[model samples]
Target: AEPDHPIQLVWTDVNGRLSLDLSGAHDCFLNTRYSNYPVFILCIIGEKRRGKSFLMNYIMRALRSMEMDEEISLGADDEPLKGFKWSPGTETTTKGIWMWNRPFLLNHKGGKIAVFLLDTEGSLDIESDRETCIKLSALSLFISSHLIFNVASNLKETELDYMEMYMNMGEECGPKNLQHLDILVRDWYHSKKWDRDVARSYISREIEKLEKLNSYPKVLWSLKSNQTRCFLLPHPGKGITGESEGRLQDMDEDFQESLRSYVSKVVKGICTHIKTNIDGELLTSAHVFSMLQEFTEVLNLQIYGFSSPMEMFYAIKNQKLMGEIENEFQDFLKNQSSLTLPPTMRVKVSQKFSELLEKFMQFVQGSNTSSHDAMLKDLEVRLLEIQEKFCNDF
Candidate 1:
């Protein structure tokens, strides 16, 4: 079972604006032993009471096993499933977004990596409106590396529309934090005909349909580029909703077997896609933590929510990149004063500046924010001013 204490790391307030609880984040991320390891996060988001928490409970167990380097097991068959809290009733068990405070360190590629699990829920309640849903959804996409969208049955157009909106935002942000999207369909009726490969074929055809029918090609591009796929899960039987207390034996054979396979698949896939910045540089959990802090720092500049969630996300990343460029150029100037490279070579100073400017240009090209042109102008003048002052008689 997860902690009974609060796990709501992010939530929209009564004003329906997003807020980050740094205290919560500090406990989960900055304090973890694997804080320096590159991160891989798995999060589940979809309709309420669709067994999002139920599935995550199993996922947690499997990951715990992986972290210990043991065979994945769900404990005794008599052991009732428990991790992130869930109830049989229809009330929303999760609010805004909650993350497990302890991160799992699993062996992958050649070394150990840190992983996080997050469960997200949006309200259908009257007090909490639709915009609240959009805010939570975007927030999960920002933090998650492997995301599962749990739907009751078929994928709906409304779902696609919501995802498309976020995809556009990620497009502008210029880096995709999300590496995998698994569309898990619950209570799938075609269980007799479906296996893992069948489900793969099924999800592929649906994506292909969108690619053909949807006018925007970039929509399909984003889906495909980000490893979007699906899994079909049979019902857990009616007894599961009653007083059975979530026993593995109470769940149907097909459901349990499929769940086992899905959980294992998710655990293995963690190392396959390591978290990275826009330039594909690996990021430690500490680095990711700072980005979230920067996200809040940039957000707090205005006293309101962003018009789009990723507007602030893109702004922070680009702003940091600009500052990195400045730092690098400034250090190159300082190093020059420490020792003259053949003091008579004024042309040598010119040569280094030319090459260094082009190197900084490559990073600007990587982020490619809307303000690229203006940033370039500012950098050029700033570097020129620093160079003249630092090297008067070179």
Candidate 2:
């Protein structure tokens, strides 16, 4: 629940635009005179299906029924988005500004919040829209308090190039702000297969070249490349590398551990440090769940309101079980009551949280399930129940 009084901490923004703003007051501050309003903007920029829409929906739905989950930011809940939307361009573009004032209203308060999400055009090749998206995406990071570099699959040279260019520009702006970068690869490759150490060394070599040439390794991560920069370390190929059905599955276990730790730690540092002036404690599990659900739902909508047979196949078989868990938690927060907070809220949310945790754990611990197109029907039923509950409730 929101504190009776305002928060005490200044700010501690999340690292990624795809982040949940559980922080209070939509991360806004009042002047000493309590006159002018501080603008709290969260900008999300990334290639399509890397999960920008998913992230946006998570924030939107979570904030919609927020009671006093002050840790969750309402910046993304300002207004209902209308019209068919695609990537919002760079933080500097006209389309970029399009995300302004998109907030979720629980009651009737004109929340002091703003969330801007850009579903940058995807580029498989470096010279494609991905390149332009990468450059402008970096600019979004400049003015943004948070950013999420969403990746759908394994990391490659092209993606690295994008990061290198952006980071190099960040370096020019000063290394101080470079930490704001946060990479989130959606549909990640298996960790046990890829060789991140080798990748790191390669990145280091590239960074060295850039440094020597006095050029920006902006997307390169760093010439002094260590494991600090994010990279994909997929599992051994289930089939083949270039072939349609291969899963790389022989990554060094040590590197695998390092990769996970790196991701979590980096997100922790970047998110906490970015919003230095945010008030009060950081967001809670309920807040995060709600925020993430909202983000996911939007993507489901774009995929045709979670009704597509093909899309439904992916979601139900793998995504829905876990996704629905988040939906429940978000629903709980949106419906949580202060007088009932002490026990009831905990009980209800925990039940749902446990279920989601189980699914996510399976994702982490269980091997990829065999392709089950047949399971689609069963999944659709379960998914529909969750969807019905979500729509009917909060």
lDDT of each: 0.70, 0.40
Regions of model 2 farther than 4 Å from truth: 1-40, 63-68, 71-97, 103-119, 124-135, 168-175, 191-394
TM-score of each: 0.70, 0.35
lDDT minimum window of 10 residues, candidate 1? 168-177
lDDT of 2 at 260: 44
Angstrom error of the Cα, residue 82, model 2: value is: 10
The prediction achieving the highest lDDT against the true structure is 1
Tens-digit lDDT string for candidate 2 (189-227): 555533446545544565565656533444443224322
User: lDDT per residue, candidate 1, 36-78, as tens digits?
Assistant: 8888888787777778877888888888887776578766678
In candidate 1, the residue pairs with backbone N, CA or C atoms under 3 Å apart (3 or more residues apart, or in different chains) clash, namely none
